Design a protein around this ligand. Structure first.
Ligand SMILES: C=C1CC[C@H](O)C/C1=C/C=C1\CCC[C@]2(C)[C@@H]([C@H](C)Cc3cccc(O)c3)CC[C@@H]12
Ligand SMILES: CCCCCCCC/C=C\CCCCCCCC(=O)O
Length: 435
């Protein structure tokens, strides 16, 4: 099939446009790849796609061990086969740095080097938002470049940009949003992602019922598994609006913040508004015990797992990157009392262990993030230094400044409701063993 699909899109588009696609395609794959590298790999990839439309696909492998971008662990794969490389997954770029230049910078760069300007743009935009579906990336960059080409040669560039930008605002927002939401999905995988979104919703609207939010976590998860990856037909645009309707139908009346978000002029704005919403103050209800019962074994439903996750989230002041991090191992541990000779026995024993481990994790995590959510950043720094002073009596102002600096930096990246999963997974591990 595809052994003729690579060749089909080549002929249908032609070498140049097929090179623009490949540029976007590979920039997504190598988030850390430099412009020269990515462009070089593309130079040669198209090269063979033109000729062989395996014999020279091998030429690449070898040469890759270089002018080409490098995935983490390429040195290993170069041990040989040898195509251990096509198995190396890339980690998403969780810290975009893309900033659009002023109109003059764009037009000047464009008048001088039309090809290079568009290659620099496709490469930079695609490496920063590489998790948005290819179809969306390809579409926004062509519409964008079409705007640049058109406006920079118009009777009045300025007003042209004012108007064109307003008409691309939607597709622009959809692409960066998609990158974010789809990058969290790829980071966690479908199961953790689903729980993650359930946790965030529980934190945003603690007064709701599992029933009000579970359908929401389910829906977005389905939308992500269906639309994060599409080569030419984007469905994120077809799916999100109705998703905002489910969101509003279920939480519009349960929460003032949501009621307002549901007033936005577009589904994109409503969505963005509910995404940025921080974890609300938790009503702090009674504690909840681990779901140590045969009901968590249900292959057909995670009902019990979801209910626990939901109830934990709305009672525990702790960021979702923390909850998601400890829930995966914990729910998986319990799950080991399912396919055994006696489930009740394996639960009564495992119970006290997981409980203490979970509490230890929650306690240290609540310490790592103490005061961050309830205060403005500066007012947070102050209370933080104060807590550290109390714990480190012989600490010199300099040693304290380093600790406040280190801890506050960590908290600004891993205590918000939308902290970067991959980056915080590592940092959280490091910080737990701290103090
Ligand atoms: C970079 C690496 C990873 C590291 C290795 O050493 C060499 C290498 C080759 C990968 C290639 C080049 C040949 C065509 C392949 C196998 C791609 C597709 C199967 C074909 C393809 C190419 C352009 C647009 C498309 O829509 C489809 C996927 C990865 C491509
Ligand atoms: C460092 C994050 C975990 C925090 C400790 C929570 C206690 C969990 C108890 C036992 C571990 C069960 C092993 C499950 C394997 C999943 C892989 C993983 O640890 O992420």
């Amino acid at each position: 099939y595809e052994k003729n699909k690579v060749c089909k899109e080549f002929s249908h588009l032609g070498k140049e446009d097929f090179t623009s696609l490949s540029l976007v395609l590979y920039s997504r794959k190598f988030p850390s790849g430099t412009f020269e590298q990515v462009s070089q790999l593309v130079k040669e990839v198209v090269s063979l796609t033109e000729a062989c439309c395996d014999t020279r696909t091998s030429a690449l492998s070898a040469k890759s061990c270089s002018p080409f971008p490098v995935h983490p662990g390429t040195a290993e794969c170069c041990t040989k086969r040898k195509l251990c490389m096509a198995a190396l997954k890339h980690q998403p770029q969780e810290f975009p740095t893309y900033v659009e230049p002023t109109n003059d910078e764009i037009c000047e760069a464009f008048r001088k080097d039309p090809k290079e300007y568009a290659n620099q743009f496709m490469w930079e935009y695609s490496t920063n938002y590489g998790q948005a579906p290819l179809s969306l990336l390809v579409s926004y960059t062509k519409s964008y470049l079409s705007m640049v080409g058109s406006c920079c040669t118009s009777a009045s560039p300025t007003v042209c940009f004012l108007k064109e930008r307003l008409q691309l605002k939607h597709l622009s927002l959809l692409t960066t949003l998609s990158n974010r939401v789809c990058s969290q999905y790829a980071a966690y995988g479908e199961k953790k992602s689903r729980l993650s979104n359930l946790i965030k919703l529980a934190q945003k609207v603690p007064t709701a019922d599992l029933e009000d939010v579970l359908p929401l976590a389910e829906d977005i998860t389905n939308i992500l598994s269906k639309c994060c990856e599409s080569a030419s037909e984007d469905c994120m645009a077809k799916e999100l609006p109705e998703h905002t309707v489910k969101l509003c139908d279920n939480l519009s009346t349960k929460n003032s913040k949501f009621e307002d978000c549901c007033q936005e002029k577009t589904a994109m704005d409503v969505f963005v508004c509910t995404y940025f919403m921080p974890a609300a103050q938790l009503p702090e209800l009674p504690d909840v015990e681990l779901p140590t019962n045969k009901d968590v074994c249900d292959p057909g439903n995670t009902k019990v797992m979801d209910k626990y996750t939901f109830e934990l989230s709305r009672r525990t002041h702790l960021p979702e990157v923390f909850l998601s991090k400890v829930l995966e191992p914990t729910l998986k541990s319990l799950g080991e009392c399912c396919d055994v000779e006696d489930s009740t026995t394996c639960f009564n024993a495992k119970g006290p262990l997981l409980k203490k481990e979970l509490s230890s994790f929650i306690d240290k995590g609540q310490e790592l993030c103490a005061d961050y959510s309830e205060n403005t950043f500066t007012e947070y720094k102050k209370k933080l230094a104060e807590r550290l002073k109390a714990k480190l009596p012989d600490a010199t102002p300099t040693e304290l400044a380093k600790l406040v600096n280190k801890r506050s930096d960590f908290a600004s990246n891993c205590c918000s409701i939308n902290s970067p999963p991959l980056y915080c997974d590592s940092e959280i591990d490091a910080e737990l063993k701290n103090i």
